[PDB]
Amino acid sequence: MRGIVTIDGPSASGKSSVARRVAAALGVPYLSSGLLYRAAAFLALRAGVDPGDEEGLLALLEGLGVRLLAQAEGNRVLADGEDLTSFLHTPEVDRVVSAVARLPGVRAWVNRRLKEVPPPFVAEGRDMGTAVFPEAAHKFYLTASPEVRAWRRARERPQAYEEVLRDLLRRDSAPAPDALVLDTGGMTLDEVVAWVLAHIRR
Numbered sequence: 768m769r770g771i772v773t774i775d776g777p778s779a780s781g782k783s784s785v786a787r788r789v790a791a792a793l794g795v796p797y798l799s800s801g802l803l804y805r806a807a808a809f810l811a812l813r814a815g816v817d818p819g820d821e822e823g824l825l826a827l828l829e830g831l832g833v834r835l836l837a838q839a840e841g842n843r844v845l846a847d848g849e850d851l852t853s854f855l856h857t858p859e860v861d862r863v864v865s866a867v868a869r870l871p872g873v874r875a876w877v878n879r880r881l882k883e884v885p886p887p888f889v890a891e892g893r894d895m896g897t898a899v900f901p902e903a904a905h906k907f908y909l910t911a912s913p914e915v916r917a918w919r920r921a922r923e924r925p926q927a928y929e930e931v932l933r934d935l936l937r938r939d940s941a942p943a944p945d946a947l948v949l950d951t952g953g954m955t956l957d958e959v960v961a962w963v964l965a966h967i968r969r
């Protein structure tokens with residue numbers, strides 16, 4: 768459209784699929800901020816560094832020129848020209864990404880890469896409408912119960928719901944004050960896409 772749409776929410780709340788669909792429907796890119804955090808975690812694991820060493824990790828990230836490629840069928844992340852995406856939506860990354868996402872310098876690094884992109888676009892994450900694009904014209908926040916979130920994530924991991932839920936509960940972004948809050952347990956994600964688009968297009 769003109770400017771920026773943010774779609775935030777907890778893990779497996781549906782924000783990823785909804786941002787991709789909304790963006791395609793508006794003919795603009797979507798940016799998955801979490802794919803950059805997943806990349807930072809995956810690189811730190813493979814590099815064999817201590818992720819508590821922020822300086823070394825940033826040198827690694829800054830050095831391999833890690834970049835987000837927004838494609839309409841899905842974002843990709845390249846490191847030194849290698850597409851890392853197929854290694855990022857895995858149990859090992861899910862389990863360690865919080866260690867790196869809490870590092871202030873990692874968040875600054877992800878946010879710099881996001882702020883590089885010219886609007887319009889749809890950006891999805893935890894704090895897109897609060898920390899990174901508080902000026903966004905259209906903000907949405909998708910809530911979901913832990914059960915609904917676990918059930919969804921289990922669909923895409925070797926683990927079953929019982930295990931995913933336990934994991935999610937131990938793992939457990941407030942909404943922006945101006946975000947439309949929608950509970951994806953009560954609306955289907957197809958209904959959510961429609962509803963978010965009706966709002967943006969008003």
Ligand SMILES: Nc1ccn([C@@H]2O[C@H](COP(=O)(O)OP(=O)(O)O)[C@@H](O)[C@H]2O)c(=O)n1
Binds near residue numbers: 777800892
């Ligand atoms: N704006 C963001 C996005 C992701 N993250 C971290 O990156 C991880 C992966 O995000 P993701 O969007 O790819 O996956 P989900 O856990 O959100 O389903 C999150 O679980 C966050 O721990 C973050 O801290 N802030």
